[PDB]
Amino acid sequence: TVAYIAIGSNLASPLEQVNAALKALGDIPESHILTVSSFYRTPPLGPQDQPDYLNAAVALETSLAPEELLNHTQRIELQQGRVRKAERWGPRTLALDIMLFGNEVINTERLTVPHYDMKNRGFMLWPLFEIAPELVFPDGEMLRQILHTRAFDKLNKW
Ligand SMILES: Nc1ncnc2c1ncn2[C@@H]1O[C@H](COP(=O)(O)CP(=O)(O)OP(=O)(O)O)[C@@H](O)[C@H]1O
Ligand SMILES: [Cl-]
Ligand SMILES: [Mg+2]
């Protein structure tokens, strides 16, 4: 199954954390990285004192069940990052999100796939579009169409 995973880091110097996370993703049992998007820099909207995020998308081939994959991404979050005691704004220093999991639709207590809010997030859509411009969602929506309908500002590279 090809799963698409979004990575976000809000560290001031996020490169080493992102690399540790990438290596960890490739180390997941029965899985390996097919492709990684460029690293993108995404703004603090409104309040400026917020730091830039590094965002990227990863295509991961995996034979694991979706919930097993989630187990691993959550483990990697716990191992490679921390929870900011500030607010809900920036929850964790490292965020791993399962955007798509093959052509599967998932709606459980633990897992909503396609990711529940990804169509609202340019920082998820643009890096994904770089590595999968032809992507079609399980319901037939098209990544290209979502970007064509909404007009999200392009992201600069890290
Ligand atoms: N596709 C998916 N990828 C990752 N986590 C997912 C998910 N679908 C559901 N979840 C759930 O999302 C929960 C965490 O949500 P919250 O932490 O409250 C918001 P967040 O994850 O900080 O940022 P987000 O809402 O921008 O994705 C997890 O406990 C996990 O069960
Ligand atoms: Cl999916
Ligand atoms: Mg999340």
Side-chain angles (χ1 to χ4, degrees):
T1 305
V2 175
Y4 288 104
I5 295 168
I7 300 173
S9 176
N10 57 29
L11 291 183
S13 305
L15 289 181
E16 286 178 16
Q17 188 188 238
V18 168
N19 268 284
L22 287 175
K23 179 171 197 319
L25 291 174
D27 283 345
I28 292 175
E30 307 193 69
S31 314
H32 68 105
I33 293 178
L34 301 168
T35 300
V36 180
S37 78
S38 296
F39 300 163
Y40 293 91
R41 179 182 298 277
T42 59
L45 299 182
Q48 54 124 176
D49 286 11
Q50 324 173 209
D52 288 339
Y53 265 86
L54 187 160
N55 285 113
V58 178
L60 186 78
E61 177 64 38
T62 185
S63 291
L64 297 175
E67 68 275 7
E68 293 185 293
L69 180 58
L70 180 61
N71 285 349
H72 290 276
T73 61
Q74 290 182 345
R75 163 182 61 78
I76 297 171
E77 283 178 337
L78 290 165
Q79 291 174 331
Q80 303 304 146
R82 64 172 189 84
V83 196
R84 288 192 194 270
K85 278 193 166 181
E87 200 79 352
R88 191 89 272 254
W89 61 333
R92 308 183 182 267
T93 54
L94 177 72
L96 298 172
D97 286 298
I98 298 167
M99 294 187 285
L100 285 319
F101 189 91
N103 197 54
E104 298 190 23
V105 173
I106 306 167
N107 298 110
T108 70
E109 298 97 341
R110 299 192 59 197
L111 209 40
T112 293
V113 175
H115 184 279
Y116 84 96
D117 199 45
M118 67 179 292
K119 295 188 277 168
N120 282 311
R121 311 179 171 194
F123 60 85
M124 279 180 154
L125 304 170
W126 276 116
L128 184 59
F129 181 71
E130 176 206 316
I131 64 170
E134 305 306 322
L135 188 158
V136 175
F137 289 77
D139 72 349
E141 291 175 75
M142 293 164 303
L143 177 55
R144 175 209 77 260
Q145 187 58 78
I146 296 170
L147 288 163
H148 165 95
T149 296
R150 283 298 296 275
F152 293 100
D153 291 335
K154 276 183 171 164
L155 316 171
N156 287 285
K157 289 167 184 178
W158 191 259

